[PDB]
């Protein structure tokens, strides 16, 4: 039957996911709880600890310090920006691994990513979150929810909606194999604005959706309507990307000291 093909698709996606995303949910949960037995992320809970562990790495990542003169809120907000930039590239790599994606019209590929990357970023952000904080720098750091919320307006609440989403989403207990297919389904959304050829996209998504359904039935036998609940989360993620686009407008009304990374400028352009 075609069920075997659906399991092969699910496995292929999982393997690609492992290859594309350095910090898996499995590894994240281990850190957030206990088993790291090697990690021990630096905890940032206030201004003092922030200074102390401004990632601490002398600074090996690209773009040295000197990001200074800019207040804490702006620096943290820009840090999230560069994280997204990295994430967009990991996600693009992943999307190109989905059977049929690279054969789609190139402009539609751009459109699918443009409208899909943030939805995926917030989905995976949940993997690194618990009710008290979020892992940063591949688990080398942990910033508390309370700290992020203490940031001056309008920065003190850009993370709050994500944490709220995460708590409910994580309650569903999806694992990396589930997430790989879930993410693929989000990317292949035929209702993105401006798509040229909707049919080929829907064909691919219908198959991914069947694969997701079977994956949930086998991997979460006793989870009633997990599939139905998951589809709903799809629409919720939509709301977060729009809710965030707003706060991003209120921000450019006061700080002409922000400046958005070119890749994010392109993605946000005429998004919503």
């Amino acid at each position: 039957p075609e069920s075997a093909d659906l399991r092969a698709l699910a496995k292929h996606l999982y393997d690609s996911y492992i290859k594309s995303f350095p910090l898996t949910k499995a590894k994240a949960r281990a850190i957030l709880t206990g088993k790291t037995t090697d990690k021990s992320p630096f905890v940032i809970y206030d201004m003092n600890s922030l200074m102390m562990g401004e990632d601490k790495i002398k600074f090996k990542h690209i773009t040295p310090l000197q990001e200074q003169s800019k207040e804490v809120a702006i620096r943290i907000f820009q840090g999230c920006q560069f994280r997204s930039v990295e994430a967009v590239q990991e996600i693009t790599e992943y999307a190109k691994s989905i059977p049929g994606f690279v054969n789609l019209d190139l402009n539609d590929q751009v459109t699918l990513l443009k409208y899909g990357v943030h939805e995926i970023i917030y989905t995976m952000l949940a993997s690194l979150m618990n009710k008290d904080g979020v892992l940063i720098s591949e688990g080398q750091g942990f910033m508390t929810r309370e700290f992020l919320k203490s940031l001056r307006k309008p920065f003190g609440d850009f993370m709050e909606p994500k944490f709220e989403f995460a708590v409910k989403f994580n309650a569903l207990e999806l694992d990396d194999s589930d997430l790989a297919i879930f993410i693929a389904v989000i990317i292949l959304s035929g209702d993105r604005p401006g798509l040229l050829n909707v049919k080929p996209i829907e064909d691919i998504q219908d198959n991914l959706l069947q694969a997701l359904e079977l994956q949930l039935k086998l991997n979460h036998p006793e989870s009633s309507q997990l599939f139905a609940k998951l589809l709903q989360k799809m629409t919720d993620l939509r709301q977060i990307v729009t809710e965030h686009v707003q706060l991003l407008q209120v921000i450019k009304k006061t700080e002409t000291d922000m400046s958005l990374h070119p890749l994010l400028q392109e993605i946000y352009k005429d998004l919503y």
Binding site: V88, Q89, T92, E93, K96, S97, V102, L106, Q109, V110, L113, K114, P262, L263, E266, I267
Partner: peptide
Amino acid sequence: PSILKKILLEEP
């Protein structure tokens, strides 16, 4: 000008 297009076109 499209960075996404460029990233999509590079050899995996």
